Copies of this chain bind each other. A is one copy, B any other.
């Protein structure tokens, strides 16, 4: 069982959401975040930036080990523009999941 964090361009939210729901992904959180991921500059609201923090979105999903690769592919394809600032995806282990209203659990990896 894995957590997938994707830092993405804010306008891409809806497209990425649609791709994920269609891939059968059920639960999801977004938060507002500022970031920089610098190779050589990034454009933002018209301006050039090197090392300053720029408004992005952090999208978080928890997924079965087997689903990881296709979910990544799906995110990459939906969020890419090819311009610097497209963002990053991180994969980390999750031990356990609990639904608050039912108490229902889950353990994979």
Contacts and interface: CB of A to CB of B under 8 A. Distances in A.
B38 A88 contact: no
Interface residues of A, number: 54
Given A95-B2, A95-B92, A76 B51 contact: no
Interface of A: 2-3, 6-8, 13, 17, 21, 26-39, 51, 53, 56, 58, 62, 68, 72, 75-76, 79-84, 86-101, 103
A83 B32 CA distance: 26
A60 B87 CA distance: 14
Integer count of this chain's copies in the complex: 3
Contacts of A81: 101
Contact of A94 (B21, B27, B82, B91): B91
